[PDB]
Amino acid sequence: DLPLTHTALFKQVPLDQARELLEHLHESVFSKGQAIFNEGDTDRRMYLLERGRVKLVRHSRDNRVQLLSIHTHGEILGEIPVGPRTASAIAITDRTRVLWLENEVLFKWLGHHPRVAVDMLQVLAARLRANNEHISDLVFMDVPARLAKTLLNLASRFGEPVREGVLVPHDLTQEELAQLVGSSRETVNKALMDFAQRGWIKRHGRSIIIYQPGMLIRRAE
Amino acid sequence: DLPLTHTALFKQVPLDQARELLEHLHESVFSKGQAIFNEGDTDRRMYLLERGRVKLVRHSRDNRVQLLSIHTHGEILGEIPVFDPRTASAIAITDRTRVLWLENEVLFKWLGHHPRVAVDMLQVLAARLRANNEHISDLVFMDVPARLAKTLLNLASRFGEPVREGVLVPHDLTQEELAQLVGSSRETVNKALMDFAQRGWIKRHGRSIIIYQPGMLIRRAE
Numbered sequence: 001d002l003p004l005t006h007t008a009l010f011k012q013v014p015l016d017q018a019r020e021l022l023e024h025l026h027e028s029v030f031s032k033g034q035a036i037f038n039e040g041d042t043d044r045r046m047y048l049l050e051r052g053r054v055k056l057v058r059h060s061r062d063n064r065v066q067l068l069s070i071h072t073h074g075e076i077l078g079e080i081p082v083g084p085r086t087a088s089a090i091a092i093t094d095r096t097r098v099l100w101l102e103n104e105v106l107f108k109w110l111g112h113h114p115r116v117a118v119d120m121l122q123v124l125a126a127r128l129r130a131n132n133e134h135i136s137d138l139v140f141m142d143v144p145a146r147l148a149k150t151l152l153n154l155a156s157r158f159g160e161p162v163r164e165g166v167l168v169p170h171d172l173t174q175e176e177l178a179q180l181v182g183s184s185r186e187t188v189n190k191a192l193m194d195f196a197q198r199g200w201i202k203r204h205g206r207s208i209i210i211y212q213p214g215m216l217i218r219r220a221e
Numbered sequence: 222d223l224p225l226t227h228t229a230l231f232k233q234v235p236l237d238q239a240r241e242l243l244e245h246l247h248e249s250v251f252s253k254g255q256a257i258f259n260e261g262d263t264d265r266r267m268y269l270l271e272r273g274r275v276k277l278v279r280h281s282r283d284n285r286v287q288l289l290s291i292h293t294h295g296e297i298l299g300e301i302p303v304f305d306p307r308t309a310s311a312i313a314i315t316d317r318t319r320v321l322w323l324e325n326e327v328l329f330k331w332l333g334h335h336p337r338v339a340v341d342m343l344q345v346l347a348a349r350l351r352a353n354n355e356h357i358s359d360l361v362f363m364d365v366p367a368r369l370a371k372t373l374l375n376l377a378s379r380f381g382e383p384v385r386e387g388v389l390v391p392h393d394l395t396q397e398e399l400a401q402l403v404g405s406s407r408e409t410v411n412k413a414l415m416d417f418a419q420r421g422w423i424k425r426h427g428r429s430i431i432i433y434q435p436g437m438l439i440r441r442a443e
């Protein structure tokens with residue numbers, strides 16, 4: 001499904017208890033290409049993306065950059081603090097603004113309102129089961145199902161309703177979109193060609209219009 | 222990298238609040254092949270595998286078994302209960318498999334009585350989702366021998382028994398089943414396994430595997 005957001009994580013937090021964190025929320029602004037955190041850091045902070053776009057990347061073999069995710073407003077960047085950083089977070093847009101707080105403040109705050117952790121537990125529960133079926137999926141899903149799943153994921157988080165459906169301004173490179181799908185840009189470009197000639201989508205340079213999201217859902221399984 | 226266990230979720234529970242739940246823990250025993258729960262069922266229970274081994278499978282639309290994971294003693298079977306059906310079926314691998322389970326109502330009233338435990342059950346779920354993100358990161362960078370090494374290491378770390386020659390892993394899986402956990406063809410996985418045996422890293426004993434040199438699998442899994 002959809003990654004962690006502040007709204008989903010803080011939906012059951014009463015307003016007065018959420019107020020207490022605002023003094024401890026730091027605000028940072030990043031320029032294009034600037035790293036918000038790096039792979040393997042040990043700061044143990046919780047970052048909230050407020051404005052802009054961020055990509056979780058992964059420099060590994062031969063120092064080849066590997067796109068893992070792109071994120072938008074309201075989403076938690078990376079993992080919840082408790083374990084070094086599994087990935088690097090790079091600001092896509094200039095004046096990318098993130099709010100963050102140290103883990104000590106969060107755990108003290110959760111200690112003050114332990115009923116909040118009960119409802120956040122249902123969020124990590126619902127997200128870990130969704131994360132598990134994503135792991136089984138990449139074993140048993142062909143590339144059109146994986147393409148349909150990425151386009152649906154991007155549409156639900158970046159989608160703009162247009163006349164013929166939902167436009168998806170992903171603004172990735174053809175290699176990048178293929179990295180999210182999980183195969184070569186050759187295989188993915190052909191799968192996009194099939195989706196287009198079936199009438200399901202249209203390729204708008206670095207945007208994609210989804211004419212028939214209901215068909216992509218069925219193709220996902 | 223380890224799936225959820227009772228001890229990991231309940232390490233921070235004071236002894237008093239763990240005793241209050243024993244009134245509501247039901248005990249069921251299953252023989253080999255029996256389903257503990259089925260895919261698409263809507264029970265809101267938390268299952269704890271106490272003794273035996275269990276596999277999580279999902280049946281596709283042409284009724285072919287898809288092996289997702291296998292579990293051993295101490296682990297939570299399937300998902301943790303939540304107020305929104307089960308995404309998989311749990312099948313007993315061993316005879317007289319014993320599971321303990323409690324209804325979500327009992328769990329949530331108990332979390333309500335002791336909300337402080339959910340704070341630290343939150344941090345294990347957080348560190349556990351971090352583990353899966355590391356796992357998804359591997360499958361794009363790992364070739365077939367790396368995933369085979371990691372799969373055999375994962376099985377060895379949970380149901381492995383140290384012997385003088387190394388670690389005996391009585392996995393009891395078919396070549397098709399093991400290849401589904403590795404994530405590629407039965408032929409491709411069998412040949413990678415053969416390379417491991419030819420190199421002296423493992424030996425294939427029926428459906429048990431001795432890992433002569435587990436440290437070699439560690440290096441290869443990177």
Ligand code: NA
Pocket residue numbers: 368369371372402403
């Ligand atoms: Na693996």
